[model samples]
Target chain A: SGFRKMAFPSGKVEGCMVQVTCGTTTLNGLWLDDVVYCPRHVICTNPNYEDLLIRKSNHNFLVQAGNVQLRVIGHSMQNCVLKLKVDTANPKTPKYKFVRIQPGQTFSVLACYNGSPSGVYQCAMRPNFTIKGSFLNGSCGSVGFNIDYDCVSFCYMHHMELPTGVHAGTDLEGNFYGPFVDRQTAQAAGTDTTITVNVLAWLYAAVINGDRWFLNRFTTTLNDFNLVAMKYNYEPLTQDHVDILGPLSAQTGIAVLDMCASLKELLQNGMNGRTILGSALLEDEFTPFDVVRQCSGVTFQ
Target chain B: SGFRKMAFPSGKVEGCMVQVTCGTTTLNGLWLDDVVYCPRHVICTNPNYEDLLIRKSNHNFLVQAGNVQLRVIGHSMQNCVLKLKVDTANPKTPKYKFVRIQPGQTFSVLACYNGSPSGVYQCAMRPNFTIKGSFLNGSCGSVGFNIDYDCVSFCYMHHMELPTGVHAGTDLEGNFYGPFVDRQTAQAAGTDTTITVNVLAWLYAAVINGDRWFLNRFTTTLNDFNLVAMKYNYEPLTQDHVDILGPLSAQTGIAVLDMCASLKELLQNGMNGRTILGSALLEDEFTPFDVVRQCSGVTFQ
Candidate 1:
């Protein structure tokens, strides 16, 4: 195995940046070009990749672009093609534009070219497997976890807008809280915004999701286990107030860091399970096998 | 006594900021009207003041123009008659065209235009003062020994390129320690940018010159004290580096507030003698008299 370092700046695309590298021995995949290593921002009028192939497990090129649509396609012909393309709108949504690459190939292409491009580009890889392969749950030899702290940091840096709240279970009178009288009424008198639930859920999971096996059995007056919730369990949510300041306000997500900090402290203090379950939810793997198995990998039981 | 609040934003002329209405006071003085008030920063065409009249307690004005002399002649004139004029040169400094304000002064006359056809107009007053004031000092009380602090703050703000070793003192050989280097060099080489003795002495005198004596003295150090010094004095300057990464930049100028806070500390401690003798150099009346006198007045002394 070999080791190499790569740095990629955010793309001009509205979405997040993504880079892919294919080379012999995954190590070669990570050594990005000098231009990609910028920590500060700079605008490149037209940026393209330089293709170079490493023979024997080492042959491949590094892929890079801003908030790109990424995909890995392999072919077994003399001229094998690996195509990647990016969609500006809904960049997270993918499309495959035709550009072909030769296997055991190394090279780069710019999206802004005037004429017919060489390779087919695909957007399916977006929100792509940020990293592949796994290792060391401790005691295991090699370790592999994408240094995904960037994604976590990105969520904190950008989105935090609160959207839907848990539906009010049927009232004793058998009533439910649905959308208010109108959009204006919802904005002016009610507690919800226009943000969708999927966006909010995606943001939370991207930032705080991780496998935790020992925590799912947890349940308490404060929170149910295995269903990821807001960062701080006791933090009172106020749609009324949070609405005025908008979603990215400090009041909106400061609790997330607070919750994570508390959880880490609990773990550092010898995985204090009882205390965590008393106030917050944990990942599914955290539940006892008997409970998780019975519930088919959820903590509802 | 009439009490009111006055505020000014950044970039206003130094002194005429806040004025108090201790009694039945009227706002009839040199107040700056954001260019909206006077869209022109009309250069004083003339710089001589020979015929300028002397009024009792108000500030006087004089002008010196090249080979020609012009002065503001005034009486207890109920209405301000600001004369405007132009000139080519002066005998004094090469760049500065002499300008003088009259004692019963309402404004710094920049140009003049009489309603009459004798449009052979003279110079007129401009809104030189950002704030108008018939009185100075808070509560109509006289200035005390706080000028040192103001001097420090003002110097730090006004001067862009501070000289090196501006903070150190003569150790018999005058060999320097403490901040013995210029801010730029110290910044480039990564070291302390001491407010040297000469700069301090000049700055010390500047703030205290006509303003509240003691306040300016305190404001000086408050503005100039860098983060290194501040963190040295107050350890929890920042609980975490990541939390306030931007504020630690050279431009924060937080020393202004630090000085204010430290003054509160000094007052609470009653400004003992040793602290005065060593630190409060500008407090002395007759230079030494006031400083030592105030020191002795404190309970700590």
Candidate 2:
């Protein structure tokens, strides 16, 4: 139950984006083809995908080896310095560069490794850099490079070249990572900017999807989120958000006697059949108010 | 009484800012010292007073003038053209100037006249000019100049020099004139900009004077003014005015059992003793609500 490999019905899973988080490290936006992992090491070859993945090895951060280029995006109103460096057990001519990105700009630098006849060249491009800015967080992506091994000749002369391909931030299994670190940074500083952005993103996505149940769930979450955020001096809900809730609430009320009523029922009777995302099992005895209060505490009320 | 000369216990009298309205003429900010006139022509000398005084003689606007300059102030967001012209009877080389003032800017011009040793010269600076803007109303002031009467020993030496002095807006008999023309102009078009400004001015003045009764009267007038203005789609009371009224209303209410409570009593018993400014005696039997509703019709509630 701790960790399991994802299995499916063996059909093409279109629009399949994966997001995985291991402790504080997250990898996201990994396409299915880009995932390559084993117990010893998990490596993803994508630099355009500013994904992040790391393993706790020997009480140190160990990332799978691959060549990657990283870029971090920053806001226009602030200054930022992103220092990219290679950390290794036996560092040999470390391949990394410190990119100073100006406001409203992006810096892209190359990190390449080639396997020679003498030795195998490899390095991992991870989110192992210091971001200095007002919030000290931003968006980033990466590209990975690997050498191909194939030749046909009678009297052969061995030659190799780096094959480059772009990849964004993702896990070794190509799972798309959202702004997890950015969100964590904001939360750590006691700001709701990232949380608000997430709530808004989910609401808009739900509205576009036209799924009533999902909309109701997110609306409840948003309402609770607003109440909790208010107590924490977070930015207040905008008028637009309040306006959207009116019609959505009305529609949900009429669609089912009341989705909220069902939610209340689950709380009163038992939370046996309920499972909230990223929350502990709801098999314990609890009132609906208690459930909501607990859920709202994590800012999903 | 048709007119009365201001008689005095006359010691500085402090804030004697009076505003008076006569037929189409308005005089404002008149200090007592500037008024000198008889029944035929109401003259005020002190263009610097930015005051207005006029008479309708033979169906012509007559202002007793020595030499006066006028400038009109307008909002910076609108286009305005203020034309000052001498609407004369004899039209002896009429002296007047048209000034164009841009938004966020003020224009000051000179109007001078001298009696050619043949006639006793005098003219009153009145609100006879036209204001051309979106609202077509602004503020104006003038400086007055007169020929010196006493010269020393032998031959008369006529020299023109600018005389410096300070005077306020008032009629020849020292009757105050308000921004009445500006108010009328706004009312004729069913607007409330000038009215709101006047109310705000009076309330601030009352607050400074610490006059509870005066503040209450103005508050009642303002409330009624806003209600009537809203009825006619006039500009509503600004947020600032409402904010100021909170503390002011509390003060006004505590100062008296309720000045407005007496108004309610009048609605039941009929208004007898209540008299509004610039109105005929309230001898006619009428309910207080009716009186207010009627008085507010002129936008002064």
Candidate 3:
């Protein structure tokens, strides 16, 4: 809510550059101080609670980086810790009680930060809970669902990677760990220079455990990349190619960087899929810069 | 003609990012080496000889930094030199002749670079000679005219600034000079800070010599900034603001930097013009960074 404006040319008719800001003069979280340079980027850094806290929950914060919380798409929480100061004597005391963070599952909470250093936030009972990086379903208010990159990434991370820290069904210990794997751990764990558990995770879910849900997510994701793709004369994906992924298994997890790169390589091999990313992903030069652009916001010139 | 492609993720199922490049590996001229980073920007820097040589001239290169020739828009030329192996024996020998580099004028030429360091280029007899930082009319070809920024700036440099080197009508005795006033001369010519003859040229062109062409150019440019302006919720120009510029004349000429800034100030004065520049112009933080973005290409995120 601490928003302000920067007048271009220091005043008047220069142009309308009025935009979102943070702290006091810090316009957009890209800077810690006043930014004299205006960069053309879409909104993401300022995930206004009202913007993402689906009406059911009607609250905020996901993808936490210290005190800064960001909503990937409509629903998600990372490095999150929830503690309820409650009375356990009655079942009615904790009405509408479960927390769901799976790919398509939706749940609701008031999601007000309790100002605690421990990253704990407070939420209370509601008719239905809202928002994820999860699909905002009936518990949340009726809002048209338009899938964006953040939403895709959140869902992809779950189906493709191991539950590094998120509280999910697979972890029965009530561990409440961070959902996203850190870059260092991801790189060190059975991979060349990749981060996240996606490639190997897919093998475990789809190939080993034979969970068709991973395939379901993968099929939907591949098709979606082609579905809403726009700008440029790049090729779109063919429906049959999803089968090719079935026979593959990696010693280590296939990196997100490598994933994008391999796809690029296949693009060169005659047949291809959707390549209309505002962000470009080159195989040989895959870096953190490329990943963040897709996850955060895209810059199109 | 020698164009290829680079794959994202090095394979398939990526997004589309096919774009214009130059000299084979030298894509878009931003690189001499194989480019790895994909940047978003509208086209420029390639001149492409065919792209902006203008259908009228049907050739290329304006705003020469060196061997590189860039077309600012449909029409423009800078740091140019013209030489003809003329047969002065008879008036008819020259055929369709004369090179006109003024705003809104049209001419024709073959424009085959003769490869002379002295900057001599070859042009021969045609039904009509064509081109400039000038408007293209029925001289050689019929083309629709859209007033883009390049056309505006080219025309602007003329009316608001003095003749630095261009071969305009005022210079006789064949003292053909370059049309654009370089940065150094513009900064030193009786001013603390500025470039080109613009700020001061306006006075000489519109006030002292009493030529209204400069005002005419300014008015048109200001309005065009509004005409095709798209994207973003930027403010547009009003009809009455041109009067504010009438009284003011710089000792030298107003710097393009200062000009944009002054207009920005006027906008703050409760009156304004189009400020929807793809490139943002900030007053307190003006830099070479801002100007070239407008001149070359725009990046909108």
Candidate 4:
């Protein structure tokens, strides 16, 4: 089981698209970056009837504690060709990974930082990792990937309330984004690049297919959101979410739940059951997470 | 120049970090995905005193018209292994890339869609693109990249007022985001995943180093924003951005421009010049683009 193929669509097949290996392995695929440097290039097999099939990769490494393994996939490594270093913070000390490569020289490594001495394999990598390339010339290092970007901090260095054992080094899929993560289910995300729906997008597909481990975890996250929402200070935030998103149905002329239910019925009726034209997938549209962001006031200039 | 190395930090320099290749040539490195599957694994060379060096990759693609080229780098392909798909939006047509690989096998392809049959090389790949890997098990194609994802649409199809010659297929650096694009300067974007700062981040880097092409273009975008901003109907939005972010310095106790000026002075002092204790570089902070987003009100659930 690798990445999934687009189920069905109205177009030709037998083409290829590019994707960077967000991790050393193809298990994780990143198409965005807060700073820059998302890699890729993959072959295609079929088409998308509507929803494109996407199966999350394990994206894990050897470091594990409290039963959670360190995930390097779908996470930013700052400068992938630079080296590792320790960042001294008050509560905890973490490691930072950077990149530097020669023009025309090729290199590869696992995208991880040593959270502690226990974080092994943070640097372990696969055979074809950034192999055999001729880097161009630029400032900073004679030659290297974006060496001035500190994703180590971008992804996690700035945060303090990370879950126990969830050091940036041990973050699964880099979901522990420091400045961008929400204390709620947003904590299950690696970066805001994928927006707030990262978890929702995957879970919806998980039910259709099955990545039970994450499925169970997501349920925990959902329930946890509930728990936190019920709390005094957080209750209003939850209500705020509803107030902002409640009218989504009115805008679209349908209840979000009903739309979800109907979509669920189509998926259940025949995972590939619907023969709709120009469908992007349930996850493609603004998820509740997306709505929540709009409601929560996430904006740009 | 390839990726750069960390300038200097208090730690080891020999370890490596991983980064998935966003484009087939390892030119574009992805660290996030709206769906999944950014490929990479770059070898590292050194440590970070602080301010990890990061140079933006060209991320420009081949399709060109009115002197604009197609960009595949830093852009998300919904499903790297699935296949190409056509979406029917009356405004225009677009192609989607999907993934589908087999277990114990390796595969790759350029990430792109056929916007109007004019943009070529969307799927043209380099030698080491998503070259080798064993896929896991999953639903959908049972063996493909995020097949259910349609970045073609995510990045473009959802919009109408795109800049001339800026189709998802012909986009440079996937900067021409669809729904997420800023009808103003934001129009020069690809996906919301990168936030509004995608341009600011790279442009800042570009000035220090020199990617004149983008730097020049960004100026145009900046100027255009001014013209539009000074015009009717958009004045408040611009003023609103300043109002929302104008207090940034008070919050952080520093003027954004002064901060930029000071950082510029430091870079002038030495590219790898400063011996700072801990720094994430100028672009790492909330860029004007990011501030724009916050001021603009982009949110999620």
Query: Which tens-of-lDDT digit does each residue in B42-129 have in candidate 1?
Result: 1122222122222121123232221223333322221112222213211221111112321111111111111000000011111121
Model 2 docking grade: incorrect
Question: Model 2 residue B271 lDDT?
Answer: 27
From the highest lDDT down, the ranking of the candidates is 4, 2, 3, 1
Cα error, candidate 2, residue B191 (Å): 5.7
Query: Which run of 10 residues does model 4 chain B get worst, by summed lDDT?
Result: B117-126
Evaluated with DockQ, which candidate comes out highest? 4
Please provide, for model 2 over B1-301, each residue's C-alpha lDDT reduced to its tens digit, 9 standing for 90 to 100.
0110001111011111222222454322222223211121112221311233322222232333323322221101101111123222222221222222111111111111111010011121212111111000111221122111111011001111111111112222223222322121222211212223223323332333233332233225446645655553334555554553444345444322233233323333432432233112211112122122221211110
Query: Can you write out model 4's per-residue Cα lDDT over B67-103, one digit (the tens) per residue?
Result: 2233333322331221111121112212334232221
Best by TM-score: 4
lDDT (10s digit) by residue, model 3, range A1-301: 0000100010000111122222221121111111111111111232333342233231221222224443322222222211111111211111111222322122111101111110001111111111111111111110111112212101111111222211111111122223322222341112122112222222222222122222221222544444322211233433333333323333224433334344333334422222211111211111122222222223221
- Is candidate 1 or 3 superior in DockQ? 3
Question: DockQ scores for all the models shown?
Answer: 0.01, 0.00, 0.02, 0.04
Q: Rank by DockQ, descending?
A: 4, 3, 1, 2
Worst lDDT 10-window in candidate 2 chain A: A1-10
Quote the lDDT for A164 in model 1. 24
Pairwise DockQ winner, candidates 2 and 3: 3
